[PDB]
Amino acid sequence: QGAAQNLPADVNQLIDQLERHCLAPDGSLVTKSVYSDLQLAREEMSRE
Amino acid sequence: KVIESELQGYLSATRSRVGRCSALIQAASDVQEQGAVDDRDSFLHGVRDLL
């Protein structure tokens, strides 16, 4: 029963830690490109 | 002879339609593309993609 309680957390942690290293690949940048684009809005505000 | 002088002025008249033809399309893009602008509202998926 106890191991079943951790399973939703266990299945999360399998890829959760690697998704920081998965952030740079396209598995995240299809939305998370803003981080690789450094605030994809306009790189914060300078002139735009 | 004024017509030929004004034909160059008329040349601006006819080509202005081409300028209208080459510009009016952008106006309809804001309304016709609303089904393809779902990219950064799926960026909102990323922030809520935590789980």
Tell me how close the Cα of A27 comes to any Cα of chain B, in angstroms.
11
Does B49 contact A31 at a Cβ distance shorter than 8 Å? yes
Kindly state the greatest CA–CA separation across chain A.
Answer: 58
Judging contacts by C-beta atoms under 8 Å, the chain B residues touching residue A34 are: 43
Report angle CA B37, B39, B43 to the nearest 5 degrees: 140
DSSP state of A43: T
Q: Which of B40, B50, B49 is nearest to A37 (CA)?
A: B40
- Are the C-beta atoms of A34 and A41 separated by less than 8 Å? yes
Strands (E), chain B: none
DSSP H helix total and E strand total for chain A: 3, 0
Q: Which of A3, A8, A33 is nearest to B51 (CA)?
A: A8
Is the CB of residue A12 less than 8 Å away from at least one CB of chain B?
yes
- Are the C-beta atoms of A24 and B33 separated by less than 8 Å? no
What end-to-end distance do the CA atoms of chain B give, in Å? 78
What was the elucidation method? cryo-EM
- In one-letter notation, the amino acid at residue B28 is A
Q: Among positive and negative, which fits the CA dihedral A14, A16, A19, A20?
A: negative
Please give the resolution of this entry in Å, rounded to 1 decimal: 8.1
Q: Which two tokens stand for residue B6?
A: 């004004």
